[PDB]
Amino acid sequence: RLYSGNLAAFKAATNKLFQLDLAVIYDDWYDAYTRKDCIRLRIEDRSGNLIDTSTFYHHDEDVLFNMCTDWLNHMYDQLKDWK
Amino acid sequence: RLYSGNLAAFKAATNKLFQLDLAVIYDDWYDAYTRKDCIRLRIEDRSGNLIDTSTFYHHDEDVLFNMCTDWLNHMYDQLKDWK
Amino acid sequence: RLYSGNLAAFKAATNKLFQLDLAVIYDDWYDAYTRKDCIRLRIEDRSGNLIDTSTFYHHDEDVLFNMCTDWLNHMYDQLKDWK
Amino acid sequence: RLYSGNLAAFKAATNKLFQLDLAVIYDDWYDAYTRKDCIRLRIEDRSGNLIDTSTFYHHDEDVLFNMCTDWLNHMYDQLKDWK
Amino acid sequence: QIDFRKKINWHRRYRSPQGVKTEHEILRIFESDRGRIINSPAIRRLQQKTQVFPLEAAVRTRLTHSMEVQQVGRYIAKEILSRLKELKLLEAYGLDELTGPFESIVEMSCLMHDIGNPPFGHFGEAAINDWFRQRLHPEDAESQPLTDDRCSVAALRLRDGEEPLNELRRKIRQDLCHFEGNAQGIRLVHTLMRMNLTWAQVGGILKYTRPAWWRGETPETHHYLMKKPGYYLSEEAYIARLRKELNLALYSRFPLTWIMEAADDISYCVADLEDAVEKRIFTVEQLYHHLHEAWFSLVVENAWEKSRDQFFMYLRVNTLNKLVPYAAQRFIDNLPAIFAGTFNHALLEASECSDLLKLYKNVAVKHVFSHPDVERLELQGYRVISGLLEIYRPLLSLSLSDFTELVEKVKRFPIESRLFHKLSTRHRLAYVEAVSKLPSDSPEFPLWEYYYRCRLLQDYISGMTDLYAWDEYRRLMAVEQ
Amino acid sequence: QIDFRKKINWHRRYRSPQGVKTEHEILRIFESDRGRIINSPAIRRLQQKTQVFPLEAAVRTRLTHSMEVQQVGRYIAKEILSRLKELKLLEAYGLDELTGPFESIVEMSCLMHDIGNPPFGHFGEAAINDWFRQRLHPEDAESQPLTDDRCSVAALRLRDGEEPLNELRRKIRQDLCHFEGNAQGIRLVHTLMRMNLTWAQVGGILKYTRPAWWRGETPETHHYLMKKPGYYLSEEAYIARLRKELNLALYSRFPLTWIMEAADDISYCVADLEDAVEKRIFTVEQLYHHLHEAWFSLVVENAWEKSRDQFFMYLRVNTLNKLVPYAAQRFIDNLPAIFAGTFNHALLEASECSDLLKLYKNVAVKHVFSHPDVERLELQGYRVISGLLEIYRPLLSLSLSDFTELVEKVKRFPIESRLFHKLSTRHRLAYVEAVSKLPSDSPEFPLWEYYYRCRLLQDYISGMTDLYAWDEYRRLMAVEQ
C-alpha cells in the first residue's frame, strides 16, 4: 500500500498551493488498456478557471504520488515568482 | 414442536416392549401427496423376524406419537398374556 | 518422561500381586558409577518375610518399568499355581 | 522523604534565576566522614563563567533544600539590583 | 548391501507419479511435499499450544521449539553427508543424486514431531487413558472368560463359549486405552487431513514399532524399539503396505528417524532453561551455582568466563559443536545396522555428552519444573479433559440403530443430536468412510462400530488447542455465557 | 563481468574470520548465521503480531506468513540455480561452490522481512509520523530561515545568521519524521540486538536505497529503487562500509534482494483470502462468483472444476507452477543489470501473472479489508500509539543537563525518573554508547543528543507487540489495575 510519508508530502504540497490562493482538483481512475492507474490534477484559482492540467500513468502508486508532488512543487516554484 | 411428556411416554412404552425380549424398529418420513407425516413401526424378536408392522399418517406430530404409543401398549397387552 | 500406559500396567501388576495376599516393596535410586538408574523390588507376605528380591539397572526408564512389570507377572504366574 | 512544597519552592527559585539570564549548576553526594549529605551549587551566565559557588552539609534533606533555596533567593536579591 | 535408492521412495498412495524421473523432478516432488506440510492447519494449531509455561511475554510455543529441532536435524544431516563425501563413499551408497531429498525428509520429520499431542500434553494423554480404562477395564480379558467382568459395554464382555470373537474384543479393549501422540499423528496425516505424502515422508515419522493392541513381553532383540505404542489397529493394513514400500521387516524402523530422535534430545534441555530467566524466576549467577553444585570444563568454563540475550547465543554454539559430530560419527559407524532397521540403541545413548545432557536435565527438573504455576496448570488440564469426556459420554451410551439413524440425518434425541452436531466435519466423514467398508452381515459389526465411535471421540478431543478446550469446557458447564 | 565471489562475503564486523577457507567452512559459517537468526527474541515477538484479523481460531500471525515467504523464496532460488546449471553457466559465474550460501541467504532474508514493523502495522507508522510531524514541522526548514518557524524545540529552530549548523537541523528534522520498517529492521539487527551477521546477510535485507533525510526529487534513473526510505542517519557510516564490502555504488541494490521482493508479492494475496473463509465471512461459491465478476482460464477453471481444506492446497500449487518459472526467467534474462545493482524494475512487474495477482488483490480489497472489524482495529491501534507517545512526552521536554544527570544514576524528577526506568535496558545502553562517542565541545552536541533521545523513544515504542502495547496503554491511563 501507499507509504504514509509520501501522502504527507503530497498533502503538504497541496496545502502550500492552497495557501497561495490557488485551487487543486484531484481525479483518479484505472486504465485496463494500459494496465495502470491514472491521476489527473487540474489547478485553478479563486474564480474557478483552469490554469494547468496534467495526467500521470503508473503501475505502482508510490512512484505516482512522488511524480505528482514533484509536479506540484515545480508549478509552485514557477508561479510563486509573483502572483 | 413435540411435547416432552408424549416423547417420554413413547420411550417408556418402547423400553417396556424391549424388556419383554422384543425389538422395535422405527422409520419415519413425509408424504407430500397426502400432505402429512408417516411413521412405520416394525416389531421383531431376538432372532430378527417381523411380527407386527403398522404405519400411521397425520399432519400433527402430537397426535401421531399418541397413536403410536397406544398401539404399542395394545400389542404389549396382547403379547404379554404369555411369551 | 515415563509413558502413562507403562505406569498403568505396572500398577495393575502391583494390584494383582497385592490381591494375592502378598506385599510389594519398591525402592529406587541412581548409580553414577554405571551411569544408570536402579530399581529394587522386594516381595513379602502378610507376616513381613522376604521371598524374592531383584534389582534392575537401565538408562531409560520406559524399558526399566517394562522389565519390572514382566518380572512381577512372571512371579505371579510362578506363585499363583497355589498359595 | 523530601516534602513536595520544598521541592516546588526550590524549582521556583531556580526558574526565577534562569529567567534572569543566569545558569544554575547542581551537584550532590554523601560524605560518610561527616555522616551527612552534601549539595553544591555553582551559578553561571550565558558564557559559562563561575560567579558564586557554595556547598551545604546536613543530615536531613528538608533543611538542606530550605537552606539552598534561601541562598538562591539571597543571590537573586543581590544580583537583581541590576544585571 | 547399502543402497539408499531402495529406501527413498517418491511414490504416493493416490495418483502416484509413475515412470522414470530425473533429479529435478524428484526435487520438485519433495518441494511440493514441503508445500503441503508447511501450509497445513496442524502447524497453525501448534502455534497456540504450550510448551512449559502458560501462554501470556516472549515464551515459546510448540512451533518455535519445532523450529529449533528442524535446524538441529538439518545441521546433523549436512554433517553426515559431508563426512560421507570426504571418505568417497557417497556414490557407493546410492546417495549421489539424493542429498536434497535426504535433508528435506529429515527437516520435515523434525517439523511434524508434535503434530499429534493432545491439549495439555502429558496430562491430557493420562486423563484420556484413565477415563477409558475405567470404562473398559482391559486387565480382565487377558485369559479365559470370567464371571466378574467389570466392562460396562455389553458387546465387549467376554462371554464364555466363543473363541473367535473373543480375540477381537481383547484387541479392541487393549487398543482403546493406549492413546499416544505419534500414532495419532500418523492417523492425522493419513486419514483425517488427507495430505497424500510420499512413502518416505510418512515413514520418517514412525518412531516406535509396538502395536497398540500388544499384550505381554516384547522380544529381547527389540526392547528399545518397542517401548511405546507405534500405531493403532485402524492403520494396520496401511502400515503393512508401508513396509512393502520400504523393505522393512516386522517391528523395524526407517533409518533417518534416528537422526530426528537425536535432535529431539538436544534442544529438549537447553531451551527450557532460558525461558526460566525470561519469566523472572532466577538469574545467571544462580544458573552457574546450581550447575556447579549438581555437576564439563570446556563448555561450562568458556561460557562462564567469556561472558564476563548474548549469553545463551554463546552457550548453544559450543554445545552444538560438541554434540553434532558425535552423532554424525555414531550414525556412520553403525550404518549397516541402521539400514537394516534393527539397531536397538539410540545415537546419543557413557561419553561426556550424556553427562552434559543429564546436567542440563537435572538442573531443569530441580529449578524449573517444580514451580507452582506449572504444577497448577497440569492439574487444571487434567480436570478439564476429564470434564469434557464426561460431558460427551452420553454419545457412547446409545445403540447401533439409534446412532446409525442419527448419522443419516432426529426428534427422539435432542441433546444427543446437538452434541453430535457439535463435532467437526472431517471426523464425521472419517467415521462414515470407515464404517461403510465394513461387511454388514458379520457378527463382528457392533465391535468395529463401537471401536470407530470411540476413535471419533478421541480424534475430536485430541484435535483441540489448550485455550479452545478450556473455553469450551467452561461454556458447556454453564459457568460463562 | 559477473562473478558472485565478489558479492557473497562471509566476513563480519567484529572478530571476523580471516584467511583462506574451503566450502565446508563457509557452509558452517552460514549455518551459524542461521542459528543466530532463528533463535532470536525478534522471531518470538513476530509470533504474537497480527497480520489481518485480530488474534483470537487458527488465523495467521506474522511468523506463519514469513514461513510461506521463506518457502517461495527457496523454491525460486532452486529454480534459478537449476536453470543456470542446465545452460552450463554455473561455473562461469562463480557459483560452483556457493549454491548453499545462495539458498540460505535468500531464505534468511525472506524470514527477516517483518522484523522491524511497529505494533498495528501501517497504522502504527502513521501515528508516529503524524505525532513527530506536529512536534517538529519539517516543512518550514526547506529554505532560508523564517520568522514563523513553528518548531517546538529551541535548539532545532533555524536561526538566521549561521549556515553550517542549519544544514544539520534540516537533516535531523526531516529524518525524525520518516520512520520506516526496513530502516528500523537494519538498526535492530546491527545496533540493538548485536547479532554480528555477515555482510551478505545484512545486505540481503536492504530493500530500498533512499536516505531518510532526503529532500527533493530523485534521479530519473533510480525512481523505483528510491520510492521509500532505506536507512536512518545514525547508520550512514555503517552503510558506507557495507558498500565497500559488497562493491555497491551509491543508491544501488544487492542482487538477491530482488528474489525476496518477488516472494513477498505472491503470498501477499492468496493467504489472506483463505482466512476469510475460516472466520465464517463467506464461502467458496461466493469466492468464485466474485472472482468471475471482477475478472485466467487455466488456473481458475482447473481449480473450480477439479474441486467438484483441500481446495486451497490445489489452488496454490497451480499458481506457483505458473509464477515461479516466470520469475526465474526474468532474473536470468536481466542478470547483468541486477548484478550491477541498477535495475529500475521488479521481476513480476504486462503478462497474465500481473492480471492474476491484480484479480486476487482486488477481490481481497473488496470482500475482506472492508469488514468492520479490521477497520475498528485500525482505528484503535492508531489511538493507542498516539496515547503512548503523549504519555511519554514529558521525557522530551527536559534539558541536556537534567537528562544527563538522570542517565548517570534523582530527587528533583520523580515522575520522569520512573518513566525513564520503565524503558528497556538494551535501548538505554544503545543511547549511552551512541552519545559517548560524540565530541563534548562542538556546538553540535545538543542537536545530536536530541536526535538520539528521539531515536530511543521510537525504538521503545516500536519494540512492543500489539497486546503488550494495548495493555500498557490501559495501565498507564488508570483504566485497569
C-alpha cell at A82: 509573483
Would you call E129 and C63 a contact, using CB atoms and an 8 Å cutoff? no
Number of domains within chain D = 1
Q: Cβ distance F430 to F191 under 8 Å?
A: yes
Neighbors of chain B by Cβ distance (3+ pairs < 8 Å): E
Of E352, A63, E146, E203, give the one whose Cα is nearest residue F228. Answer: A63
Q: Which residue has the cell 562463480?
A: F94
User: Which residues from chain E sit within 8 angstroms of residue F36, using beta carbons?
Assistant: 313
Shortest distance between the Cα of F355 and any Cα of chain A, in A, equals 9
What are the angstrom distances between the C-alpha of B48 and each of B21, B24, B26?
11, 10, 14
Sorted by sequence, the CB contacts under 8 Å of residue F88 that are 6+ apart come out as: none
Contact B7 E401 (CB under 8 A): no
Q: From residue F101, how far is each of F92, F107, F115, F338 by CA, in Å?
A: 17, 10, 21, 18
Chain C hits for E130, CB-CB cut-off 8 Å, are 8
Indicate yes or no: CB of A8 within 8 angstroms of CB of F350. no
**How far is the C-alpha of F398 from the C-alpha of F204, rounded, in Å?**
40
Is residue E113 part of the annotated active site? The answer reads yes
Please tell me the number of Cα atoms within 13 Å of F173 on its side-chain side.
Answer: 27
Question: What's the CA gap between F466 and F121, in Å, rounded?
Answer: 9
CA F136 from chain centre, in angstroms, equals 24
C31 φ, ψ to 5°?
-110, 110
Q: Which of residues 219-238 of F touch A (CB under 8 A)?
A: 223-224, 227-229
The one-letter amino acid at E43: I
Rounded to whole angstroms, the Cα distance separating E470 from E54 reads 13
Q: A65 lies in which domain range?
A: 1-83
F218 touches chain A (CB under 8 A): yes
Please choose, from the candidates E184, E208, E167, E222, the residue with its C-alpha nearest in 3D space to the C-alpha of residue E444: E167
As beta bridge partners, residue B23 has B44
Rounded CA-CA distance E208/E346 in Å is 12
CB burial string E20-59: b at 16+ within 10 A, e below: eeeeeebbbbbbebbbbbebbebbbbbbbbbbbbeeeebb
Q: Contacts from B14-17 at CB under 8 Å and sequence distance 24+?
A: B14/B72, B16/B76, B17/B43, B17/B72, B17/B75, B17/B76
Integer Cα distance of F112 and F114 in angstroms: 6
Secondary structure, 3-state, E10-27: CCCCCCCCCCCCCHHHHH
Bridge partner list, A58 = A37
- In the block, residue with C-alpha cell 495526467: A55
- How was this model experimentally determined? cryo-EM
Q: At F45, phi and psi to the nearest 5? A: -70, -40
Task: Give residue F293's Cα distance to chain centre.
Answer: 35
Q: Which residues pair with D56 in a beta bridge?
A: D39
Q: Please pick, among E15, E24, E418, E421, the residue that the annotation labels catalytic.
A: E418
The question of whether F421 is a catalytic residue gets the answer no
> Which residue is closest to F74 within chain E, CA to CA?
E31
Residue F196 near residue F14, CB atoms below 8 Å: yes
| Unique residue bearing C-alpha cell 496425516 | E189
Please give the angle made by the CA atoms of E246, E247 and E252, to the nearest 5 degrees.
Answer: 90
* B44-56 per-residue burial string, b: 16 or more CB within 10 A, e: under 16: eeeeeeeeeeeeb
Nearest partner of A17 among A61, A64, A77, A63, judged by Cα = A77
Measured in angstroms, the CA of D33 and the nearest CA of chain F are apart by: 22
Contact between chains at E411 and B7 (C-beta distance less than 8 A): yes
Angle at Cα E122 formed by Cα E121 and Cα E128, nearest 5°? 95
CB–CB of F224 and A59 under 8 A? no
What is the number of other CB atoms lying within 10 angstroms of the CB of residue A11?
A: 11
The answer to whether E373 is a known catalytic residue is no
| Residue D12 Cα distances to D16, D18, D19, D70, E174, angstroms | 6, 10, 11, 12, 85
Longest distance between any two alpha carbons in chain E, whole Å = 78
Of A1, A4, A62, which has the smallest distance from its Cβ to F227's Cβ? A62
SS3 C50: coil
**CA–CA min distance E437, chain B (Å):** 23
Cα-Cα-Cα-Cα dihedral sign, residues E423, E427, E433, E436: negative
Interface test with F, best of E52, E309, E323 (most F CBs within 10 A): E309
Q: In a 3-state reduction of DSSP, which class is residue B50?
A: coil
Residue written as grid cell 563413499: E89
Asked if E256 and E109 touch (Cβ cutoff 8 Å), the reply is yes
Cα–Cα distances (Å) from F4 to F32, F94, F261, in that order, read: 21, 5, 20
F199-214 burial by CB neighbour count: b if 16+ within 10 A, else e? Answer: bbbbbbbbbbbbbbbe
Buried b (16+ CB within 10 A) or exposed e, E372-387: eeeeebbebbbebbbb
Rounded CA gap, E396 and E455, in Å? 11
Among E446, E455, E465, CA closest to E156: E446
CA–CA distance, A36 with A40 (Å, rounded to integer): 13
The residue ranges of DSSP E strands in E67-107, in sequence order, are none
E-chain residues within 8 Å CB-CB of C1?
Answer: 122
Q: Which amino acid is at E282?
A: F
Contact between residue E359 and residue E294 where contact means Cβ atoms under 8 Å apart: yes
Q: In what order do the strands lie in the sheet with D53-58?
A: D23-31, D36-44, D53-58
Q: Specify whether the CB–CB gap between F123 and F384 falls below 8 A.
A: no
Contacts for E167 with CB less than 8 Å, ≥ 6 apart: none
The backbone torsions φ and ψ at residue F367, rounded to the nearest 5 degrees and listed phi first, read -110, -5
Q: In Å, how far from its chain's centre is CA E419?
A: 28
- Residue A63 in contact with partner chain F when CB distance is under 8 A: yes
Annotation says F264 is catalytic: yes
SS3 annotation, chain A: CCCHHHHHHHHHHHHHHHHCCCEEEEEEEEECCCCEEEEEEEEECCCCCCCCEEEEEECCHHHHHHHHHHHHHHHHHHHCCCC
Contact D25 F412 (CB under 8 A): no
Contact A60 F229 (CB under 8 A): no
CA dist., res. E281 & res. E269, Å (int):
17
Question: Which residues between 391 and 420 in chain E have a beta carbon less than 8 angstroms from any beta carbon of chain B?
Answer: 401, 405, 411-412
Between CA F242 and CA F189 the distance in angstroms is 14
Q: Are residues E64 and F43, on separate chains, in Cβ contact within 8 Å?
A: yes
End-to-end, the C-alpha distance of chain F in Å comes to 66
d(CA F271, CA F254): 28
Q: How far is E79 from chain C (nearest CA, A)?
A: 27
Q: Which amino acid is at F368?
A: V
- HEC secondary structure over E237-295: HHHHHHHHHHCCCCCCCCCCHHHHHHHHHHHHHHHHHHHHHHCCCCCHHHHHHHHHHHC
Count Cβ atoms below 10 Å from residue E12 Cβ, excluding itself: 17
Helix (H, G, I), strand (E, B) or coil at E401: helix
Exactly one of E130, E149, E264, E275 is catalytic; which is it?
E264
Residue pointed to by grid coordinates 498495528: F120
Q: Distance from CA of residue E37 to its chain's centroid?
A: 16
Catalytic residue among E114, E265, E272, E459: E114
Do residues F95 and F4 touch, judged by C-beta distance below 8 A? yes
Among F276, F260, F284, F266, which residue's Cα sits nearest to residue F360? F266
SS3 for chain F is: CCCHHHCCCCCCCCCCCCCCCCHHHHHHHHHHHHHHHHCCHHHHHHCCCECCCCCCCCCCEHHHHHHHHHHHHHHHHHHHHHHHHHCCCCCCCCCCCCHHHHHHHHHHHHHCCCCCCCCCCHHHHHHHHHHHHHHHCHHHHCCCCCCCCCCCCHHHCCCCCCCHHHHHHHHHHHHCCCCCHHHHHHHHHHHHCCCCCCHHHHHCCCCCCEECCCCCCCCCCCCCCCCCEEECHHHHHHHHHHHHHHCCCCCCCCCCHHHHHHHHHHHHHHHHHHHHHHCCCCCHHHHHHHHHHHCCHHHHHHHHHHCCCCHHHHHHHHHHHHHHHHHHHHHHHCHHHHHHCCCCCCCCCCCHHHHHHHHHHHHHHHHCCCCHHHHHHHHHHHHHHHHHHHHHHHHHCCCHHHHHHHHHCCCCCHHHHHHHHCCCHHHHHHHHHHHHCCCCCCCCHHHHHHHHHHHHHHHHHHCCCHHHHHHHHHHHCCCCC
Cell numbers for E190: 493419513
d(CA F173, CA F132): 9
Nearest residue to E190 via CA among E38, E468, E182, E171: E182
Which residues 17-36 of chain A have a CB within 8 Å of chain F?
A: 35
